[PDB]
Scaffold this active site. Structure first.
Site, short mmCIF file in Angstrom:
data_model
loop_
_atom_site.label_atom_id
_atom_site.label_comp_id
_atom_site.label_asym_id
_atom_site.label_seq_id
_atom_site.Cartn_x
_atom_site.Cartn_y
_atom_site.Cartn_z
N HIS A 52 0.84 -1.21 0.00
CA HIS A 52 0.00 0.00 0.00
C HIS A 52 0.86 1.25 0.00
CE1 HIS A 52 0.69 -0.28 4.43
NE2 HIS A 52 0.35 0.99 4.54
N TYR A 101 -9.92 28.32 19.10
CA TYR A 101 -9.39 29.58 18.62
C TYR A 101 -10.51 30.46 18.09
CZ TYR A 101 -6.98 33.09 15.82
OH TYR A 101 -6.55 34.29 15.32
N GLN A 145 -11.67 34.21 19.36
CA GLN A 145 -11.79 35.34 18.45
C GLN A 145 -13.14 36.02 18.63
OE1 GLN A 145 -8.66 36.11 17.44
NE2 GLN A 145 -9.38 36.33 15.31
N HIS A 197 0.88 5.68 0.90
CA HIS A 197 0.28 6.82 1.56
C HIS A 197 0.82 8.07 0.87
CE1 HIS A 197 -0.79 5.05 5.62
NE2 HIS A 197 0.08 4.15 5.22
ZN ZN Z 1 0.61 2.32 5.97
#
Ligand code: ZN
Ligand code: ZN
Ligand code: ZN
Ligand code: ZN
Ligand code: ZN
Ligand code: ZN
Ligand code: ZN
Ligand code: ZN
Ligand code: ZN
Lengths: 129, 132
Positions: free
Chosen positions: B59, B124, B128, B61
């Site tokens: 695989h 955040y 604000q 990524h």
């Molecule tokens: Zn992986």
DNA sequence: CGCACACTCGTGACTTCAGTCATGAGT
DNA sequence: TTGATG
DNA sequence: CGCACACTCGTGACTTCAGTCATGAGT
DNA sequence: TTGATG
């Protein structure tokens, strides 16, 4: 945890923000409540999942969960374009300070969002390997 | 760090993962190096920024950064489709275990990614709104 | 000031058939 | 009709 | 065995003109 | 020719 579609497995969240044209502080009271209903209507019509929605006087925040087939310019056009049309129709008083045919600033801010940071994900990947 | 284009300001990162067809463990040695070179070329041809890329035997990524006009199905087709075509031509030996016209599993996994957590961003924004 | 995400003009696509999205250029 | 959202 | 992200058959789009993406359906 | 990655 991952959502499933015919050719993919996913988890896609975007934080979208846009402002009122000329930065007028018009999204208040009845107009703000009306906008919340209108955006909910548009999102339901377009099959867009709205996780959270916040309407401030001069800007709107939407956190959206999308499928891989829901492209950003398309959902931003649907949300901003249709809401401006519907808002001017439902709240004609908006034309007194916005008579130029625009409810919205023509730009938008869009961010991808995840529960973990990019740095944590990277670490997890190396770890799994 | 927030990028700008004609009609938008953005920071769009995705984690894309896909597997080899039949889950064969073929992405090793020079084959893995060639895949990395080919994926970077495709990403460049398509103006996608490669943040990180990891290739395991079965695989791959990719952590990518893109503009709002780069739709997911289009970049996935560009990366997977062209790499499969180019990998079989460059490493004909792949045909010994993959003779059916597919290097890849036909599904992909995709996730949005942010530099800060969803919770940090939410806190955040509230700060604000609460200012002065 | 000098832009530009924001202001304005311009182009084309496509829904909301108006007012966004796409987009270059000027200020 | 503009002045800053993440 | 059924399942499906994965296996297989099928449809159409479009590059990579093969082999993905889109996509329904049977196991 | 499949058996699990995020
Ligand atoms: Zn992986
Ligand atoms: Zn309604
Ligand atoms: Zn715009
Ligand atoms: Zn190279
Ligand atoms: Zn596929
Ligand atoms: Zn805000
Ligand atoms: Zn400019
Ligand atoms: Zn000014
Ligand atoms: Zn099925």
């Amino acid at each position: 945890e991952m959502k499933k579609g015919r050719g993919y497995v996913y988890q896609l969240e975007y934080h979208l923000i846009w402002c009122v044209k000329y930065r007028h502080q018009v999204l208040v009271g009845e107009v703000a409540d009306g906008l919340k209903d209108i955006l909910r209507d548009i999102a339901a019509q377009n099959g867009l999942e709205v996780i959270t929605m916040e309407v401030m006087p001069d800007h709107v925040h939407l956190l959206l969960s999308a499928t891989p087939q829901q492209a950003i310019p398309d959902f931003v056009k649907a949300l901003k374009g249709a809401s401006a049309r519907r808002m001017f129709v439902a709240y004609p008083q908006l034309k007194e300070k916005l008579w130029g045919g625009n409810l919205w600033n023509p730009s938008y801010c869009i961010l991808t969002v995840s529960e973990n940071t990019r740095a944590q994900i990277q670490k997890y990947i190396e770890s799994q390997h």
